[PDB]
Amino acid sequence: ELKETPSQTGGPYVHIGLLPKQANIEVFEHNLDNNLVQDNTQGQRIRLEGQVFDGLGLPLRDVLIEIWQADTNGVYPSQADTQGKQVDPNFLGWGRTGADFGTGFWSFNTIKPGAVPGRKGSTQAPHISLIIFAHGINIGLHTRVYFDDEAEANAKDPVLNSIEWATRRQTLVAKREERDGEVVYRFDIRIQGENETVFFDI
Amino acid sequence: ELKETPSQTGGPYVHIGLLPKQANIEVFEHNLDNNLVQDNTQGQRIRLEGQVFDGLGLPLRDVLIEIWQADTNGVYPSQADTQGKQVDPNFLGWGRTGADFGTGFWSFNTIKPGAVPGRKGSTQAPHISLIIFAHGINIGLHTRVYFDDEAEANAKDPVLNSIEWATRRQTLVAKREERDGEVVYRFDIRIQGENETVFFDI
Amino acid sequence: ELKETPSQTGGPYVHIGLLPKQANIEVFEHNLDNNLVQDNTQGQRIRLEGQVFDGLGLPLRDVLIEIWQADTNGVYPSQADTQGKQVDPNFLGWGRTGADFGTGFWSFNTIKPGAVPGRKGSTQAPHISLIIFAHGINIGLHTRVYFDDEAEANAKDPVLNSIEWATRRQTLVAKREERDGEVVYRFDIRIQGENETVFFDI
Amino acid sequence: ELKETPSQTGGPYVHIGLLPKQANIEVFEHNLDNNLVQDNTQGQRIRLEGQVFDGLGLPLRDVLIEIWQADTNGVYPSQADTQGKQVDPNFLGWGRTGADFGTGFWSFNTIKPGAVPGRKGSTQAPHISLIIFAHGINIGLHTRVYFDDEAEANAKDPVLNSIEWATRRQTLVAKREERDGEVVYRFDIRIQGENETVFFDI
Amino acid sequence: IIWGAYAQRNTEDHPPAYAPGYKTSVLRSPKNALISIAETLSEVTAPHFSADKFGPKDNDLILNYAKDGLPIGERVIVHGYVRDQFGRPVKNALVEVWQANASGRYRHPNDQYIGAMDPNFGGCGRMLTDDNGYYVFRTIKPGPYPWRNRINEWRPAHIHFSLIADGWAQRLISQFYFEGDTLIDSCPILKTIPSEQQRRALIALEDKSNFIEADSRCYRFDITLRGRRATYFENDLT
Amino acid sequence: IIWGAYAQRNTEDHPPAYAPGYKTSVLRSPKNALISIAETLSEVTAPHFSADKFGPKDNDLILNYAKDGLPIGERVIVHGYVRDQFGRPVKNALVEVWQANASGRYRHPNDQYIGAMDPNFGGCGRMLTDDNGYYVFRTIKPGPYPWRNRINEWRPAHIHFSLIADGWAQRLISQFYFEGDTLIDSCPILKTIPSEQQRRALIALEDKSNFIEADSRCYRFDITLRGRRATYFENDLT
Amino acid sequence: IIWGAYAQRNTEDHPPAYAPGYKTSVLRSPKNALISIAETLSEVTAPHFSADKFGPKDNDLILNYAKDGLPIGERVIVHGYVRDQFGRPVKNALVEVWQANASGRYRHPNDQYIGAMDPNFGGCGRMLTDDNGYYVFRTIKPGPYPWRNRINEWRPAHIHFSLIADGWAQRLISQFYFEGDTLIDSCPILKTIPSEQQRRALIALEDKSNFIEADSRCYRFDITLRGRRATYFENDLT
Amino acid sequence: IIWGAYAQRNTEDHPPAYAPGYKTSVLRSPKNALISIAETLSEVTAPHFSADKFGPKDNDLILNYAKDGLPIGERVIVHGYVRDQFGRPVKNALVEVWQANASGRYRHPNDQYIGAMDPNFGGCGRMLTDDNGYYVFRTIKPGPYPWRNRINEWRPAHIHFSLIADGWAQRLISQFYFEGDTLIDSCPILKTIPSEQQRRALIALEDKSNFIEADSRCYRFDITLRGRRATYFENDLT
Ligand SMILES: O=[N+]([O-])c1ccc(O)c(O)c1
Ligand SMILES: O=[N+]([O-])c1ccc(O)c(O)c1
Ligand SMILES: O=[N+]([O-])c1ccc(O)c(O)c1
Ligand SMILES: O=[N+]([O-])c1ccc(O)c(O)c1
Ligand SMILES: [Fe+3]
Ligand SMILES: [Fe+3]
Numbered sequence A, B, C, D: 001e002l003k004e005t006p007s008q009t010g011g012p013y014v015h016i017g018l019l020p021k022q023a024n025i026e027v028f029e030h031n032l033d034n035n036l037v038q039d040n041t042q043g044q045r046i047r048l049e050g051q052v053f054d055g056l057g058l059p060l061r062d063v064l065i066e067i068w069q070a071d072t073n074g075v076y077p078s079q080a081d082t083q084g085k086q087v088d089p090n091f092l093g094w095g096r097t098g099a100d101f102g103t104g105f106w107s108f109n110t111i112k113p114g115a116v117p118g119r120k121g122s123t124q125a126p127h128i129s130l131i132i133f134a135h136g137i138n139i140g141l142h143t144r145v146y147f148d149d150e151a152e153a154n155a156k157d158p159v160l161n162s163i164e165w166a167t168r169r170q171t172l173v174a175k176r177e178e179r180d181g182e183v184v185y186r187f188d189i190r191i192q193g194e195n196e197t198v199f200f201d202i
Numbered sequence E, F, G, H: 001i002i003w004g005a006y007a008q009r010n011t012e013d014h015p016p017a018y019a020p021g022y023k024t025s026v027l028r029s030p031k032n033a034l035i036s037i038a039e040t041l042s043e044v045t046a047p048h049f050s051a052d053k054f055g056p057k058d059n060d061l062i063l064n065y066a067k068d069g070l071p072i073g074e075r076v077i078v079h080g081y082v083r084d085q086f087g088r089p090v091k092n093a094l095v096e097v098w099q100a101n102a103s104g105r106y107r108h109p110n111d112q113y114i115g116a117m118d119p120n121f122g123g124c125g126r127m128l129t130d131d132n133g134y135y136v137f138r139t140i141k142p143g144p145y146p147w148r149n150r151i152n153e154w155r156p157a158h159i160h161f162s163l164i165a166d167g168w169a170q171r172l173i174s175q176f177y178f179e180g181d182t183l184i185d186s187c188p189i190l191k192t193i194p195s196e197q198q199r200r201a202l203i204a205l206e207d208k209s210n211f212i213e214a215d216s217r218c219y220r221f222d223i224t225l226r227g228r229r230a231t232y233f234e235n236d237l238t
């Protein structure tokens, strides 16, 4: 048996490689980005945004974030999904973004995912899987984003209930806001300190 | 010369073994518990209670606590006591308890100990020696409980004076309260963080 | 190249695993046994029986025996048979049995096999291949059973002729008897001592 | 922990040391011998005799034999006996003898032992424990002598029943004979071969 | 490819028949040497067992005899590969296993050890290897137990196994042990095997990456059978 | 002989409070250093427990909770000696033990592992050491079990123990393991102990000459507590 | 074959989050332990990228940003295989790489090192592994460069890489180095990895037989991702 | 303390019955394996011999048979301790010894070796060990001698000894040799013992500090017998 290749930090230039277009490097015709909504994508459109803070409260302006989520019916656009349900054919389920170099805000345009089966017949509340890379972070940090308007579903979520500190469960719930017709979920991540966001070993 | 056997955590089930009666296991006829007062025990009856908190302020509901103290005249019911004074014959001086699984409160019924000689002719203020075991605690944590109504004696206590931070000395003083005739001393223990309780290497 | 996994004794409970039904363990719906005759099986029905004796003449009551043989036309029900002849489709060619715990008798219901080609164009006399396992036996003992009414064929059998002691050749010949219409072949096996049965390394 | 000192043969002169008197060496005033009956010893007097044979049937004329047995009531004259019964005070329970240099016959004058408790509340049949030493014997051989007139008791003896070969059980039974008023038990020992006497690892 | 005979069994890689430290072998071992024969169709063929006849729980010793509850003991999965000596997988071979329960007690009439019986454990299973020679079964780890050889003899924990594969000459019954058991070093039955490397060939290894969280541990154990040689010149088998 | 204080505890011979690989310790370890004090009568005394109050089966975990039958599992005796660091026996010390059953399941409300419960096993015992510091108890060997640290974490088989002896400063709770268990090398709780020699100090050793034929195996395990120094000049304790 | 969860990540084979010698990690590492969860469909799935969208020079860093000429530097090919921990190839996984140019200068706004910029070098590429898990790209060997950790800190030459494969739990970003670089022994970022064998797992090896005469050198570098376990009994994933 | 049975004899620590290099054993060794039994009162008891019956010179082989003068030969004292396998002294055990004289000649009718007889030497002694298990006797060092196994076989110098102690199961006869004798390496009787460490257990060691000036040399030789186990639970002996 082999050992997994060891992780190393992405470093401060992680966007030359992962978001060249935004570092002003036009080497690719098709570029990956933070917009998961195609014109025929099903579901309610939502905007996910926030900032990532270090232990002193300073926002990271060199952070790289990716999200992975199910379509509107809770089906993953992946051959490993075994639900036997058809997935929305116009949905990649993944995106990538960096923080704005001045402000530190990051965002994605996506849709609100439907609920996905949990283990042993349970049902998970709607959530988006999120990972963070940056200079200083030796291994990508995994977390999940749940929605404050799904309080009923959240109370029965297996993963959330597995966190014994209820004060820490709240760090995983984004707040719904409505900016000029658009639904926005604000999710700030605190890597260290007070109200430190929960991170998972998955 | 031999090395002491290394300590290991008591683990989350430390009461199967140490308080079976309370885990609903009736294997012993005589069970050890948290009541140190027998009907002929001398001294003023007091109730000692509190909660133990982790670094996030959550009370530990799996904690095991024992106390060791002198009788009403400051004599230990132990062959190692060299005061040459007779000890109260109806006093074990030790007890054990766990926190309530729901609330996290722990308590003992005992008596207020009398003052015990300190080293080189000094006199120690009345105190109860306390030890804590729990999942996550690799070695039992030792602390002492002093009484806020013994301010005069406390100011001359050798052990308390040996703590250079006066703000930390206060973590060792229980507060006297009077619940319907009974005298109660409240002593909360903070294992980590702000107002962290002082622990000793004895 | 790899070395064969080393043999070890089957031990005294070899029937829990190999004949559960007879140790009163009903774990399987289909159980393997000592009856090789199905209703449409071709050939003359015969009963093979005997006892296995240790060096002092005591019968082994913990022995496990299996036999492997060709059908009535001398064809093996095995993909490795290269005769290009069709085998009887209602014949497994194998069976397993243990000795009766009280008497030590073992038996099989099968049919008399037809002659099988030997090496370099020779013809072997009809025979059944037999193996013995038991506590005390470190490696299964292989032997063969020939029939006393096939004296002509036996005299030309390559394997029998390869045994230089004619007195030992006779230990491999079962005796035909006729118990109420049924043809029975008696074959006793002596593991050690006088008239020790011939065993083969195959 | 220590390993037992390894055994070695007694050699052909084992009586210089163990029965000097009979090798014509008068070095001791009190000599140990084969007569266990003192004038006040209780019980029925019996004579035990026989020969010891090698693998070719030749009697050993250099053999040394000792026996160990209980008194008439089945009590051992030993501090390790825990029956809480008083033992016959005029009984050593042990003796030693060699074979006659010409004939090879050996004998003891003793009494018939009473039955002794077996393990877990069982009762052992009357028996004498016997050990053999000689040139060629690397470790003393242990056996037991039972009596043919105690057939009822013998059938319920735990040690005898633990021998699975009934033909071997008989090698441990001496035959009662009556030579001119005296009761004699004949017990021949065959070290090797046909009717080999059973030996124990005790 | 035309197949010839199985490679000769290497007698130095197996225990001998007479092994005095295993007392029962003293009267159950032939005094004459085994007679080696050249193989014929009888030795190179073997029976075929169909998967259709096996029940769904035949390889699950935890559930195949469970009546009121689950058996008591350590839940373990054992898996591995069966191959021949030249490294080829052995396909559709019948693997049968039997063992004691967690107390070291067999569900046999003659076993009267005080170790307690488990009403929900049977102790026997079977499976057919797949096309890659792979097999997998689940069980309760057996406990060691006492037996009468010398009076205080104790067997290390073990699972008995039997294989019927492509040729009768491959027929094999043996036993595998569990990595780290200290009784392995003292067992007179395991010590009948002459070489240390072969004694090690019977030890199943802890397979940590294949443990199933909050459920079962896993041991890996591979088995090697005799292999057939290919023929390129005269084919004397027949 | 006038006794002085217990020898200082050697912190390098014990795990530290903060041990990140044992996740629960992260929020249950003080951030401040422990404050060392000179001992007084409070630290050198301890309670006395009388043998009169102990029942006949308190040290027999095989029978002390048996109702309809015997518990399922491997019968084992564990014995040894308790001494102080200067080698003196520790007399009349109270030894309490608790453990999982053969399935690795504790008889606790919060243990919901699928390993099966044994209706005839309780899992807790106690004894007082004798004048030579000797103790002996009988039990069923516990099975390993899964716990949530990393998701597939497994504890090696172990028995938890606690000692109250002559002085409060000797108070100790720990755990001992069984010789040869392969999970010992991977346990993050055992790895909180810094040195290999101290990790070995928690392994009970197979004691073959003390096995009881057709009955039980035996493990030997000795325990060392802090020892008191004697005073020959000024006695400052009081 | 029914697949179960990915094997647990072995935290001892990776750097810890808090590594004081890498100063930026001091304020960017969680103080709480990570919470381990049992996997669900969320952790075992991942996206699919189609080869149709990749341009012809996406894996050719020598030509994909060349405008007036060729970039300056050492022409090298890097190739190898991506497999999971059980040795199975990882097919159609997306491998993205980025690096500095021959001067050790990144084409990033914030990089103001005096090492000169190369107008014909971009520094980023991507590819999908083939059915055998194979990948190959061509580039200019990057130069080492200074960074501010301690004032005179220097990174060994390295190429950053990222893998998105079959399951989200496999997501990995790391860096590989070049055999023989002496700065490898002094780098505080590479030293966050605890064991020497794992530090060696990041060194690409000179592959001399695969150099292309009068053209380019070649380095061989294999990558191992977490692997999934197969399920043979209860399938609890859903 | 309630005593249970003696520990099982470890057959690997003793010679086997059949040892072909010691020719006389070929026809004096059982062909069947020994039958192991569980002990009863018969095996754990043994006789008691009173010191009152021993004469003053019973342990002095130099004077107990001297008539006209002293025997010819090297004056030596042999002493040591008898203990059981758990290290406890064996008290009041009867130790009997016999040996050849300085010429290697035994005072036996059948010994017709040309080595000369000594009219003042008998060659046999006996003693009871004291409460510490100690024994001491004085003698003349025996000479080696020829015997017929192969025609030129020679025994190293040795003293035969026998012990009757607390339990019949401890009954033992053996022989000890003298440090440095070169015949020790060639003796087929000593070579029946399988291991080198056990062969060394029979060599008495020169004890120089205990030589008696102008008088005698001294050898130290300790003996270990089987030991009894203590019972703490069921006492099945009876
Ligand atoms: O501090 N920097 O600028 C750094 C440090 C490490 C890197 O791998 C990097 O590309 C940039
Ligand atoms: O996490 N648990 O449940 C545990 C961990 C360690 C233990 O020793 C234990 O008894 C329980
Ligand atoms: O003597 N027995 O009972 C035994 C000896 C070995 C075994 O493998 C066994 O299952 C039983
Ligand atoms: O053959 N002999 O005469 C012998 C052989 C060995 C001896 O120890 C002995 O005293 C005499
Ligand atoms: Fe870099
Ligand atoms: Fe535990």
Ligand SMILES: [Fe+3]
Binding pocket: C011, E155, E158, E160
């Ligand atoms: Fe077995």
Ligand SMILES: [Fe+3]
Binding pocket: D011, H155, H158, H160
């Ligand atoms: Fe001799």
